[PDB]
């Protein structure tokens, strides 16, 4: 009963440790994308490593106009305590709201519901539309640099009217090139081939390179960060 890609985020009122809000309206109203991310329970190690990782990438998400909101199946009092614990033992403050979903209404509405099954990432755009969902299970932490690549790429897609190849900006076939959406009629395929404006492998596989140098590099940065062993662990001085 999980929403589909391309569907508006189910209309709902939710309670967070920052107050009551309506989703997706609260983000739509501010012209924001949001990433809603779900966890089975407070005071859990894997999820704690994700909150901290999202927290460290907070400016990267604001820079793209993206808000973060968590969801956990525990009361608003535990959420506050858990957050306090993180800032106190880890030294990292968690600035995003957490939905307090005891009773599991929000999870059930979202099709995530056990509780072990309450995982799940919704990437939602500024029009309220679910654009991507990832469901890593509770024993596997998210790779948060990929979420950042995803919204950065969806945003370049929307703005440049382009589809994005596997492993962009390091596609093995066309590199950092972006794909021109394919023709759907024969006159359109013909006009595109006579047009001679795009690099081509077939009438259904034209591309160009319209992303700017910074955008491409912003997107390699995310992946370099995923790829490098950190200098300095936080357990060292915590």
Mark the binding-site residues, compressed into ranges: 119
CB of 196 to a copy of itself, least distance (A): 16
CA distance 80 to 219: 34
- Work out whether 209 is an interface residue with a copy of itself (CB under 8 A): no
For residue 159, whether the previous peptide bond is cis, meaning omega lies within 30 degrees of 0, is no
CB of 31 to a copy of itself, least distance (A): 20
- Work out whether 109 is an interface residue with a copy of itself (CB under 8 A): no
Give me the 143-162 binding string for a copy of itself, x by CB under 8 A, dash otherwise: xxxx--xx--xx--x----x
The neighbour count for residue 184, using CB atoms within 10 Å, is 8
CB of 193 to a copy of itself, least distance (A): 11
CA distance 82 to 69: 15
Site for a copy of itself in 83-102 (CB under 8 A): 83, 85, 89-90, 102
Q: Which residues are annotated as a binding site for substrate?
A: 119
Specify whether the CB–CB gap between 36 and 23 falls below 8 A: yes
Site for a copy of itself in 20-39 (CB under 8 A): none
Give the residue numbers marked as catalytic: 47
Q: Which helix (H) or strand (E) holds 21?
A: strand 19-23
CA distance 115 to 113: 7
- Work out whether 2 is an interface residue with a copy of itself (CB under 8 A): yes
Give me the 167-196 binding string for a copy of itself, x by CB under 8 A, dash otherwise: xxxxxxxxxxx-xxxx-xxxx-x-------
Q: What are phi and psi of 158, to 5 degrees?
A: -65, -45
Q: What is the token pair recorded at 86? A: 């993180």
Which range, of 1-9, 28-36, 59-67, touches a copy of itself by CB under 8 A?
A: 1-9
């Amino acid at each position: 009963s999980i929403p589909l890609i391309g569907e508006r985020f189910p209309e709902m009122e939710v309670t967070t440790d920052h107050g009551v809000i309506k989703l997706p309206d609260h983000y739509v109203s501010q012209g924001k994308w949001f990433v809603l991310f779900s966890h089975p329970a407070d005071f859990t190690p894997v999820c704690t490593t994700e909150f901290v990782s999202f927290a460290r990438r907070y400016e990267d998400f604001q820079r793209l106009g993206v808000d973060l909101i968590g969801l956990s199946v525990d009361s608003v009092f535990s959420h506050i305590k858990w957050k306090e614990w993180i800032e106190r033992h880890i030294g990292v403050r968690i600035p995003f709201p957490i939905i307090a979903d005891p009773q599991g209404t929000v999870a059930r509405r979202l099709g995530l519901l056990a509780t072990h099954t309450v995982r799940g990432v919704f990437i939602v755009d500024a029009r309220g539309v679910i654009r991507t969902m990832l469901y890593y299970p509770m024993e596997l932490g998210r790779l948060v640099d990929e979420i950042l690549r995803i919204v950065k790429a969806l945003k370049l897609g929307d703005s440049l009217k382009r589809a994005v190849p596997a492993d962009w900006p390091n596609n093995e076939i066309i590199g950092e090139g972006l794909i021109v959406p394919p023709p759907t009629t024969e006159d359109q395929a013909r006009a595109r081939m006579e047009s001679g404006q795009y690099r081509s492998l077939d009438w259904w596989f034209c591309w160009d390179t319209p992303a700017s140098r910074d955008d491409v590099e912003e997107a390699r940065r995310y992946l370099r960060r995923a790829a490098e062993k950190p200098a300095k662990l936080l357990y060292e001085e915590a």
